[PDB]
């Protein structure tokens, strides 16, 4: 039943607040927590993300940042009134140093976060697991976010751990140490999460600039894509059906190998059933900067939203697999699952969201590894990482784990 949401750092809290704004409108929850919708479909699975005292629905959301300024901006927002004030865990000094987030300032704050996590988990008949939004290029979302994952994992080893991780890009952010932070975090995510949606800033920037023809993209423009994707991927969890209805059934059907749990999210439109089906598998619609045609799909989930024929969706889905059989792993029969929800997202009448476990995701990891290795070979800025406690061997272990991850994807890409 219940999912506990946690958002950590600058990126994590900005995209997290956008997620709550988007799903709050879909569920008829106003900024005061009152329900003002006109459908029982909305409140069928409302308890998955919202707590009840009765005349009020409150997001089961925990907001964390070492920099206090972030909690201020979220509180000033439209829905910066729905979040329970006691669930905001703010420090005083943030600085894109993974070691400070994972071992220093972040470690000093983590137990207070766990106290709130513990308090939320006490009021849940059937806790499904955890959903974390964060970026991997920073110091808090990355270093503290993965510390929170590790600590939560060893306190709740029987609960599914899910993340929406924002992969950094030099085309969006000027911070030189982001490859280090991303690599250190990817090592944690490989061992401690069940499913990670890779939201690539490289792909988001390319989409806004090249596809959406926005010559001046802001983080708000990138986050519009993120929120539309996050709403779509959680549709299965928020409404009735059968397909990937909870975090465990989803992970059991999406993850063939424990370490291969990094998903490539897609969205259409950026508007017929054949169009939504075709545009969903188009490289230009991927939220990870990887060409799916340059790899194979191990498992895929597609969520269609709107008024359309479930008969024609079945026809089109059978057809897309038939035409592109070469791009799907032949040794995982019926590896594409479809879900069709009647409620479309705000502003669209028909939409579809793709969630693929594709070996093409190795292209994103290769990009981070190439940057990390270029930095690490010259031992650039290592001093201020080891100066915060961290060991040099963690860099080596993280690099080797990520290269092992790449080779596994390549192994199954070429397999019978």
């Amino acid at each position: 039943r219940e999912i506990v949401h946690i958002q950590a750092g600058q990126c994590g809290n900005q995209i997290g607040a956008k997620f709550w704004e988007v799903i709050s409108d879909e569920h008829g929850i106003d900024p005061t927590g009152s329900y003002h919708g006109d459908s029982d479909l909305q409140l069928e699975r409302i308890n998955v993300y919202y707590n009840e005292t009765g005349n009020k629905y409150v997001p089961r959301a925990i907001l964390v940042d070492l920099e206090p300024g972030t909690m201020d901006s979220v509180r000033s927002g439209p829905f910066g009134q729905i979040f329970r004030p006691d669930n905001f865990v703010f420090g005083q000094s943030g600085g894109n140093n993974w070691a400070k987030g994972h071992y220093t300032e972040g470690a000093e704050l983590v137990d207070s976060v766990l106290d709130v996590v513990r308090k939320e988990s006490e009021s849940c008949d059937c806790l499904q697991g955890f959903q974390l939004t964060h970026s991997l290029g920073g110091g808090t979302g990355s270093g503290m976010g993965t510390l929170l994952i590790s600590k939560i994992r060893e306190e709740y080893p029987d609960r599914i751990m899910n993340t929406f991780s924002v992969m950094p890009s030099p085309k969006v952010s000027d911070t030189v140490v982001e490859p280090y932070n991303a690599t250190l975090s990817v090592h944690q995510l490989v061992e401690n999460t069940d499913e990670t949606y890779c939201i690539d800033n490289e792909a988001l920037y390319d989409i806004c600039f090249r596809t959406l023809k926005l010559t001046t993209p802001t983080y708000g423009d990138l986050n519009h894509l993120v929120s539309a994707t996050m709403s779509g991927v959680t549709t299965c969890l928020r409404f009735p059906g059968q397909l990937n209805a909870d975090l465990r059934k989803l992970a059991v059907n999406m993850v063939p190998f424990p370490r291969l749990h990094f998903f490539m999210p897609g969205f259409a439109p950026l508007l017929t059933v054949p169009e939504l089906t075709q545009q969903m598998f188009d490289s230009k619609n991927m939220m990870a900067a990887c060409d799916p045609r340059h790899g194979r799909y191990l498992t895929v989930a597609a969520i269609f939203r709107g008024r359309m024929s479930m008969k024609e969706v079945d026809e089109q889905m059978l057809n897309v697999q038939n035409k592109n059989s070469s791009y799907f792993v032949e040794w995982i029969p019926n590896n594409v699952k479809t879900a069709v929800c009647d409620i479309p997202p705000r502003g669209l009448k028909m939409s579809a969201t793709f969630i693929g476990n594709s070996t093409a995701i190795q292209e994103l990891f290769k990009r981070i590894s190439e940057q990390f290795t270029a930095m690490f070979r010259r031992k650039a800025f290592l001093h201020w990482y080891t100066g915060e406690g961290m060991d040099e061997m963690e860099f080596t272990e993280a690099e080797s784990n990520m290269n092992d991850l790449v080779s596994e994807y390549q192994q199954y890409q070429d397999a019978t």
Binding site: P170, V176, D391
Partner: protein, 40 residues
């Protein structure tokens, strides 16, 4: 507002020296396969 760094690792060489320009003025970790242990 997006502040882009990139042109490729040439930005890295330019920043290793820019870091040394500021100087001129003046714990147990996760192991590989540790998560796999959860499948025994």
């Amino acid at each position: 507002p997006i502040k882009a760094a990139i042109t490729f690792e040439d930005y890295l060489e330019e920043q290793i020296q820019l870091e040394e320009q500021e100087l001129k003025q003046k714990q147990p970790f996760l192991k590989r396969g540790e998560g796999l242990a959860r499948f025994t």
